Design a protein around this motif. Structure first.
Motif, short mmCIF file in Angstrom:
data_model
loop_
_atom_site.label_atom_id
_atom_site.label_comp_id
_atom_site.label_asym_id
_atom_site.label_seq_id
_atom_site.Cartn_x
_atom_site.Cartn_y
_atom_site.Cartn_z
N UNK A 12 40.09 40.08 80.46
CA UNK A 12 41.06 40.44 79.30
C UNK A 12 40.89 39.03 78.08
N UNK A 15 37.63 40.74 76.17
CA UNK A 15 37.74 41.82 75.62
C UNK A 15 38.64 41.81 74.35
N UNK A 16 39.77 41.13 74.40
CA UNK A 16 40.56 40.96 73.48
C UNK A 16 40.14 39.87 72.26
N UNK A 17 38.67 39.18 72.49
CA UNK A 17 38.37 38.19 71.71
C UNK A 17 39.43 36.97 71.45
N UNK A 18 39.93 36.47 72.53
CA UNK A 18 41.12 35.67 72.48
C UNK A 18 40.57 34.32 72.61
N UNK A 22 45.27 31.17 72.02
CA UNK A 22 45.82 32.43 72.00
C UNK A 22 46.05 32.74 73.34
N UNK A 26 49.55 33.44 74.92
CA UNK A 26 49.82 34.87 75.61
C UNK A 26 50.66 34.92 76.82
N UNK A 436 35.72 45.44 77.57
CA UNK A 436 35.79 46.61 76.86
C UNK A 436 35.81 46.34 75.34
N UNK A 437 34.79 46.72 74.65
CA UNK A 437 34.56 46.77 73.33
C UNK A 437 35.27 48.23 72.72
N UNK A 438 35.45 48.24 71.53
CA UNK A 438 36.20 49.27 70.68
C UNK A 438 35.25 50.63 71.07
N UNK B 12 54.93 39.39 69.87
CA UNK B 12 53.48 39.22 70.56
C UNK B 12 52.46 39.61 69.47
N UNK B 16 49.73 36.49 68.34
CA UNK B 16 48.32 36.50 68.48
C UNK B 16 47.37 36.99 67.49
N UNK B 21 44.01 48.30 67.60
CA UNK B 21 43.08 48.48 68.74
C UNK B 21 43.45 47.31 69.78
N UNK B 22 43.76 46.06 69.36
CA UNK B 22 43.54 45.07 70.50
C UNK B 22 45.18 45.09 71.12
N UNK B 29 45.35 47.68 79.53
CA UNK B 29 44.64 46.82 80.37
C UNK B 29 45.99 46.34 81.27
#
Ligand SMILES: [K+]
Ligand SMILES: [K+]
Ligand SMILES: [Mg+2]
Ligand SMILES: [Mg+2]
Ligand SMILES: [Zn+2]
Ligand SMILES: [Zn+2]
Lengths: 468, 468
Positions: A12, A15-18, A22, A26, A436-438, B12, B16, B21-22, B29
């Motif tokens: 997670x 994939x969310x590039x967090x 962040x 979260x 998961x990439x878009x 949220x 963030x 998409x995110x 997920x």
DNA sequence: ATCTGGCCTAGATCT
DNA sequence: CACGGTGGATCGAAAA
DNA sequence: TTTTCGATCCACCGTGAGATCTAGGCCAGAT
DNA sequence: ATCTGGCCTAGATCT
DNA sequence: CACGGTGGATCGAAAA
DNA sequence: TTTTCGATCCACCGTGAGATCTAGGCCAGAT
């Protein structure tokens, strides 16, 4: 204990590039809203982030470069792939081979002139000739393992040096070990751009062939890539040059320059054909080259075979053979798997028809390798010789690096920023982590001529526009 | 039904800084990992995103601008603040006033030359003179409500036009209505940069005063900001100019220019004092101004009062009065609440000591307003007259806009990209939504002189470096 | 043999 | 030039 | 007859990679 | 009264 | 120049 | 005696806002 293991909280987080802040906010917000058992603490996120990292006695980062001793990188890979992706003891003693492919390509950054990064993608994990692990998208950045990089402009010099270092490091390493299983390795060099294919291919056009020293004395050396490089990698340039010899010698039914009256007319034909090509399609040709042997861009070779009919009429080489070269190079460059016996007989008949179209002009070395000994090297490797990131894929991986350099490294000593780039280029690659990439956009497939699709197998994971 | 209401799933989604998409992949997920009841569907995310938006018959966006009829914006605000932040019927009939403050400032973008955006932040919601809602950080971008913007270079012209439009729209609007409660409004203009304070303050230095037409005939008009602008907003410039008159007239104990031998010596003193200031501190002074009245940057006025002793020795104005002007302007510019009776008596005694230091030179209008009628306007408004985003705060809000323009608008018709900027500038402001920016770094407080801290109250939410 | 003088490579600009 | 990325509009299935 | 849910559309703006044009250091004609 | 000619504002470059 | 933002190092409390 | 947990440190690189320098259009001396 909790819903997300650390190994999926990490998925997670990627994939969310967090960022770290962040992810921490979260998880803290989910906690504060009453649910307590969903997101691992950053402590555990990072404790898995460590099992993604190799033993820190092998990661050597300096203010200019970062190199992971290939041994440790492959140990890490074969450890993670087991640790999650196999129900163990599925095989007890069957031999294991992690078939992987590697390479590099510089990419400018728009100091940090242009990264030059070795790269490694685990393709498959095979057992006793049977699949255990398959890569779902062998042209996606999901599994790009970095072996080394350094911020140096990509000359021919740095490329040849890095290839020497990596090709000796490859010969050195010893099979890896994981939980009572002794895994060997197999690496091919196919992550090559066009420019790099020139920089490496232009050692010399050597007058020999190993198998042919007609019959065979079977002795083979597959390692160090030299076979693939010389034979099929981005031979197109050589091909366009090779046939061009005939496109000049079309007068005297021979190769040599010893004749009397042959040479002046030969020069004049070179002149007029170069003027014709310069006026009709505006493409510069071999006529100006003084160093490292006759060489051209991939621009010129591609645009040569880009239309069969027009240039085929121009050169005087009858259109059918140029049709054949265009289609077979389209097969190599296509990025789809090569069916061995069909491609082999297509190449054999192309060779026969070509030699009976021009037999005075003997088989040029590069083309002799590409057509006669051509398919059997796709056979002994079972590869996609152009296998390398797609346009959208390499674009996403280079944006990966620019993101991990600008947003996911620490702006300290510079030993650390490169250390984190290397970290996240392993993490984001981990064969253990869901990522998961878009979703891509459906593109019309690469327009292919009417005789190639039988050479390819269009059950595909690839969607590039101009190359593959 | 679910853990996160849509109104907190939105919080949220913002904190963030998540795309559509995110968020969709986040929720998907979490769903796939077995837990099912945590994240609202985007349908509901957006169904709350609509209650964040005003009635679409009032949002008027065009390829150049976006304007929300202030009536609708205030209706929306007083609806959201109730909808979540009050346990209803806490008061049944007590009057309600949403005390808010507004303004604008252009900010370059490094076409989209420089945004110029009106802005509105709800400060408090008071009932019958008692607090119901308080803003936790009145200088944070948490509550920046956009009223309008347009991508126009910030001349004096566009500023004066936009201020005219907004100051008539303010006079127009009618009290808002929410669930049987009739809420009135009170808006002040304090979201002003320095440049804009010049552009508006430089109408003229008018020779009058409303209260003084000694005794008072009580008749007051507080609206349209003119009082605050002329009196205390960024009067500093005027002050530095005002006293400078004396710094030239230090010879003949009078104001006029009618004398004989007064004028030549007066000019020479202007000369030598300008040369001294130009050689010791390299600051350009009033000596060159031909248009719109004598005017200087905020640079020059600030650096004038930046050190009391040095310039105080230079000008010949004895150091104590310059100490007093420096401290009182430090109070205004500080960003902390002004204690009415202490500041008032400090200003009264400053006035007395000043007039008895220079009585020949009568009270200049701007300074006469700042000191004599000065504090009572902080009284009748109970405001922070400099109230405006901090350095880090305005930096974060301008990065908000650049993010919502580059990442959170839709790259279509251009009506839409501005429409989404306006959307997210409301959403991200919604008094209904929890929103967590990363935690600030503890900075050493703004170094203040030894006589101001009694005028301020340092129980603070602000951490700026150079202004406030 | 010198004095500048028409070409072969890197930055800048299309597409 | 090509493609990725925006967040809402719109539509059909579904929920019911 | 409403809400909800997901996928797909809309279509252009940056970006970016490859591909084209444009400015400075080196071996032939006259002294 | 004309002909160019020393100044007052926007872009570019520090910090 | 000032400040924000990086992700790991390190330390103390705590868990136990 | 281990793991876990949170806060704080490390310290530099971009960024960005304000603040300084640098190039083109207008009212006085000679015809
Ligand atoms: K591309
Ligand atoms: K700043
Ligand atoms: Mg390349
Ligand atoms: Mg401003
Ligand atoms: Zn051979
Ligand atoms: Zn008065």
């Amino acid at each position: 204990s909790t819903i997300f293991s650390p190994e999926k909280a990490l998925g997670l987080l990627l994939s969310l590039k967090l960022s770290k802040w962040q992810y921490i906010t979260l998880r803290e917000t989910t906690i504060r809203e009453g649910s307590k058992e969903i997101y691992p603490s950053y402590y555990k996120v990072q404790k898995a982030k460590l099992q993604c990292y190799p033993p820190k006695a092998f990661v050597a980062v300096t203010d200019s470069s970062a190199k992971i001793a290939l041994q440790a990188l492959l140990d890490l890979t074969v450890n993670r792939i087991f640790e999650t992706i196999r129900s163990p003891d599925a095989i007890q003693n069957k031999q294991l081979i992690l078939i992987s492919k590697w390479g590099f390509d510089g990419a400018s950054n728009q100091g940090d002139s242009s990264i030059f990064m070795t790269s490694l993608v685990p393709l498959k994990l095979t057992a006793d000739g049977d699949t255990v692990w398959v890569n779902p998208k062998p042209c996606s950045p999901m599994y790009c393992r970095p072996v080394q990089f350094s911020f140096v402009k990509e000359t021919k010099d740095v490329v040849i040096n890095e290839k020497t270092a990596m090709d000796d490091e490859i010969e050195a390493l010893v099979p890896s070990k994981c939980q009572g299983h002794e895994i060997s390795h197999k690496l091919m060099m196919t992550m090559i751009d066009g420019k790099i294919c020139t920089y490496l291919s232009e050692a010399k056009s050597n007058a020999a062939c190993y198998l042919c020293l007609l019959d065979v004395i079977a002795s083979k050396t597959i390692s160090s890539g030299v076979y693939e490089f010389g034979l099929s990698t981005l031979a197109r340039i050589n091909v366009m040059e090779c046939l061009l010899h005939i496109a000049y010698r079309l007068d005297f039914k021979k190769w040599s320059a010893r004749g009397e009256g042959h040479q002046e007319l030969l020069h004049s034909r070179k002149k007029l054909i170069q003027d014709r090509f310069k006026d009709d399609l505006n493409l510069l040709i071999d006529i100006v080259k003084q160093g490292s042997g006759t060489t051209n861009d991939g621009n010129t070779a591609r645009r040569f075979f880009e239309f069969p009919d027009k240039t085929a009429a121009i050169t005087g080489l009858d259109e059918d053979l140029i049709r054949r070269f265009s289609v077979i190079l389209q097969a190599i460059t296509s990025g789809e798997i090569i069916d061995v016996p069909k491609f082999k007989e297509y190449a054999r008949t192309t060779a026969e028809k070509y030699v009976e179209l021009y037999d005075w002009y003997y088989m040029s070395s590069t083309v002799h390798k590409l057509l006669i000994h051509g398919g059997d090297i796709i056979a002994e490797n079972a590869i996609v010789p152009i296998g390398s990131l797609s346009e959208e894929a390499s674009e996403a991986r280079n944006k990966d690096f620019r993101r991990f350099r600008e947003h996911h490294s620490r702006k300290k000593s510079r030993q650390a920023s490169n250390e984190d780039i290397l970290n996240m280029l392993i993490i984001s690659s981990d064969p253990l982590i869901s990522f998961t990439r878009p979703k891509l956009d459906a593109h019309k497939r690469q327009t292919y001529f009417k005789e190639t699709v039988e050479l390819l197998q269009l059950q595909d994971q690839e969607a590039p526009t101009e190359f593959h």
